[PDB]
Design a binder for this molecule. Structure first.
Ligand code: FAD
Ligand code: 38C
Length: 455
């Protein structure tokens, strides 16, 4: 299939801040190189940015009045090796495609986000994190090389420790602003099964949620995350359903499943909105029997689960989740600032803004990428319905997050200011200097670049 350059109205996943750009779409690498050579001959214009599957909520994969390059047609898996654990894939392959192709080799995608519909390029450019951050770091940690199409029209082969480690690490979490990742080699995690052994716990309050994450139990699990109550007044505020686990070995599987330990099950036809259309509430739900039931069902040990059960637990709730019109907000607060983190949770609950879907986890050590989002500490994602006062309230949350040494995530943001973002990322000047060195003419530009003064 040939090249196609179309004027397209683009938004992130949040369906907000739309802007019109020329979308180039081609499986031909030579053609992508030529477009970048074209933009650069100009050589100052409104530039270009790569786009993956558009799963970022904000404006990092759009470029109003300029060019956008859709990378999804470059989706070749070149090789997978079980012995070296390395995969060599085009930047356009997505993590679901990769997971499925790698399982028969006993290989596991080392960092999986809450949706598998993300490209390798998008996973690198946002240095994405998953349920295992505290044990495996973020996506960038597992990249062994990548080929970066730079502004000068050349393709630079980058490694994390080689000659241009600096450019490598500016590209990790760089939001497409150092060039176009064409291709990458990733080191996979070995596995004997496609299953998890999981322990579930239900806490009664915010204080309990924090204690559970601070009692040392986190180190017994490679994977850990929680669903968090952000609407109930204290003491119920910040109670959580915690899901922790690790990949199962074949010995740990029931005999029924040992025949095909690496098998991935197809997603079921029926979801919970399908079997129970008008909700799951009864007369017991919100009283003491409801609390007991919820606590009992969410407390367990050594439960064998496939990926969907362990890792995408709310796929069950199907049509019920988020029912556009929502603002996604994710931040992390450094571990030591526990009181400050608790204070921010209190602010949210008293705001008059109600988020039903709240993902909580304790991040581990950060990496050397100057713009990487994750830092060790308390991470949470909340989802606010758009309504009066919200924009001004999230600006107040920004101030609180900043003051308490934390940051927002670019993959979620469409509204923070440049001033706020720069203070949240003290290594931003260091990063900008790398960018100016590798792209003096601003061949690469995006709506986010301009909003956040990263240009
Ligand atoms: C339901 C849902 C759940 C999510 N859960 C998580 C989670 O648990 N953890 C997490 O970290 N994130 C999560 N995300 C965010 C998502 O993982 C990131 O936004 C990711 O970057 C999206 O990948 P994409 O291919 O859709 O990239 P896009 O949104 O299309 O692009 C994002 C950025 O990547 C850059 N980029 C894309 N391809 C290339 C390339 N080839 N070369 C250079 N730059 C490139 C773009 O220019 C842009 O700056 C979630 C998103 C959704 C919608
Ligand atoms: C359709 O219903 C669903 C089902 C699953 C999800 C998972 N979402 C998410 N899970 C996340 C999990 C983490 C984790 F676990 F901390 F790594 C971090 C960010 C996350 N962000 C999101 C997001 O929404 O952007 C979101 C909506």
């Amino acid at each position: 299939v040939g090249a196609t350059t179309t004027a397209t109205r683009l938004t992130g996943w949040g369906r907000t801040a739309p802007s019109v750009a020329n979308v180039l779409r081609t499986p031909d690498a030579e053609m992508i190189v030529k477009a970048v050579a074209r933009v650069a001959e100009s050589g100052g214009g409104r530039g270009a940015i790569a786009r993956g599957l558009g799963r970022s909520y904000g404006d990092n994969a759009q470029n109003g009045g300029g060019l956008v390059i859709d990378m999804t047609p470059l989706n070749t898996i070149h090789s997978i090796d079980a012995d070296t654990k390395l995969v060599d894939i085009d930047a356009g392959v997505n993590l679901d495609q990769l997971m499925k192709a790698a399982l028969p080799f006993g290989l596991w995608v080392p960092v999986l986000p809450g949706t598998r519909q993300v490209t390798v390029g998008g996973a690198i450019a946002c240095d994405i994190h998953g349920k295992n951050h505290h044990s495996a770091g973020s996506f960038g940690n597992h990249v062994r090389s990548m080929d970066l199409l730079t502004a000068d029209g050349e393709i630079r082969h980058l490694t994390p420790t080689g000659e241009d480690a600096e450019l490598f690490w500016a590209t990790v979490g760089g939001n497409g602003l150092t060039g176009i990742i064409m291709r990458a080699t990733i080191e996979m995690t070995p596995t004997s099964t496609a299953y998890f052994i999981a322990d579930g716990d239900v806490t009664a309050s915010l204080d309990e949620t924090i204690a559970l994450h601070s009692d040392g139990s986190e180190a017994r699990y490679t994977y850990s995350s929680a669903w968090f109550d952000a609407i109930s007044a204290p003491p119920k505020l910040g109670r959580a359903a915690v899901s922790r686990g690790r990949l199962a070995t074949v010995e740990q599987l029931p005999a029924k499943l040992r025949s095909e330990p690496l098998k991935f099950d197809a997603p079921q036809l029926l979801t919970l909105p399908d079997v129970f259309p008008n909700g799951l509430a009864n007369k017991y739900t919100f009283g003491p029997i409801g609390e007991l039931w919820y606590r009992k069902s969410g407390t367990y040990r050594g439960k064998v689960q496939n990926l969907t059960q362990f890792y995408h637990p709310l796929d069950m709730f199907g049509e019920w989740n988020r029912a556009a019109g929502f603002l996604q907000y994710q931040f992390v607060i450094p571990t030591e600032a526990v009181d400050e983190f608790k204070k921010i949770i209190g602010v949210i609950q008293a705001s008059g803004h109600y988020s039903f879907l709240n993902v909580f986890k304790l991040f581990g050590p950060r990496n050397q990428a100057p713009l990487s989002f994750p830092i060790p500490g308390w991470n949470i994602c909340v989802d606010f319905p758009i309504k009066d006062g919200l924009g001004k309230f999230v600006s107040e949350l920004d101030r609180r997050v900043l003051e308490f040494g934390g940051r927002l995530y670019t993959a979620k943001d469409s509204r923070t200011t440049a001033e706020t973002f720069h203070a949240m990322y003290p290594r931003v000047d260091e990063w900008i200097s790398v960018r100016r060195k590798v792209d003096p003419l601003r061949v690469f530009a995006s709506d986010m670049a301009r909003r956040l003064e990263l240009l």
